[PDB]
Symmetry: C2
């Protein structure tokens, strides 16, 4: 029992997978709320609240936002001189945001930011706030897993920040930091068994 | 044991505190390495490795980097016209990094980054990499927690990137994303009990 509970603690993050395919089972709303409450236990700089989670419950609003992001995405890749074949293969990786039972957009906001007159420290503060939001993202993906819910974070909305703010009527200083698809995994997976860090850990 | 396993999973992230005071009990290296390995299960964009962890095992190296950082800190705050006592109160907040049993610098590196001709997508890709490292930061803090080890992430090095690169002999595109002090907490603390998300969760 003691061994099992310690094991469980060391399985929590290993339950976390970047799930591509979801079942059509509905997701109980209270699990998302409770998961988000747990995500916001991630650390943040003193007296700041860098993270906001924006839950796209209205299906028509999600679809309109994604459709516009898709149009930007095709037009960008079309400027790059990509052939139409390779464009649909690229944009089709975003279909998961259309199909997921629920989508949540993590956002940065400057709540508690210091005001510096110089660009260097202004940028540094912004980067610090961004790291904090990413922490909250992992905490969400884990808090969902631990409630049996699959999820996938994708950069997505970072490349369409204006579209996101416009479509959601959000102020200029809310910065989207991707999109989190949520649902019951269509096909369950076994746990992660992490490999050693090897060259990803540098000793000085 | 089925319930104990379920409970252990649920407890994981709730063991994590931003710990400010550690005991002098030495940190087993094994646990840091395994925690770092778990940390790297955090999500990353496809075919990238955005994160490196730089473990400052050499005391004189740690000490010299921090001294250089402090000097820059006092110098910035002095330009701002802060009075000396106020400079010193701010600078004292960094003492935790001197005293911590172990310190690990999380870093961004553009391993697998896409090369775009335009600033917009270049900055987006960089943002996306930054969020991922943040996610790996949370994951390390939690992986350390489930192994009985406290930690604290501090924005610190983000405000002195050139010095960190110079002091550690790292190439220009390694970007420090704070610092993580690690140790056995000086005073135990119970599990967190997160409050509801409230105004940090926006419904759309
Ligand atoms: C190897 C090649 O690159 P690739 O696998 O297409 O990966 C590109 C990704 O890093 C990332 O740029 C995509 O998520 C981008 N992306 C979108 N990704 C999405 O998942 N959904 C979107 O709606 C989307 C829109 C979009 C618009 C403009 C743009 O420049 C990029 C956009
Ligand atoms: C919470 C309040 O305190 P505050 O002093 O207004 O918060 C400042 C923090 O956000 C952050 O800017 C400082 O901790 C950053 N900081 C350092 N933070 C550290 O923890 N250690 C340092 O050595 C350090 C050096 C430093 C140098 C220049 C600079 O501009 C900033 C520096």
């Amino acid at each position: 029992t003691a061994e099992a509970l310690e094991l469980g603690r060391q399985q929590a993050q290993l339950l976390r997978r970047s799930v591509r395919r979801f079942s059509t089972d509905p997701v109980p709303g209270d699990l998302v709320e409770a998961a988000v409450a747990e995500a916001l236990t991630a650390p943040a700089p003193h007296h700041t609240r860098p993270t906001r989670f924006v839950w796209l419950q209205t299906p028509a609003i999600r679809a309109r936002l994604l459709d516009r992001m898709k149009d930007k995405w095709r037009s960008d890749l079309t400027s790059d001189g990509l052939p139409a074949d390779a464009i649909e293969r690229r944009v089709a990786r975003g279909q998961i945001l259309y199909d997921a039972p629920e989508v949540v957009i993590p956002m940065l906001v400057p709540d508690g930011a210091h005001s510096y007159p110089d660009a260097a420290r202004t940028d540094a503060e912004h980067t610090m706030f961004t790291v904090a939001v990413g922490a909250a993202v992992q905490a969400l993906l884990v808090a969902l897993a631990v409630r049996g819910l699959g999820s996938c974070w994708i950069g997505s909305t970072i490349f369409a920040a204006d579209l996101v703010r416009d479509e959601l009527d959000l102020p200029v200083d809310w910065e989207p930091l991707g999109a989190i698809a949520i649902g019951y995994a269509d096909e369950p997976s076994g746990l992660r068994d992490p490999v050693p860090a090897a060259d990803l850990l540098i000793l000085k």
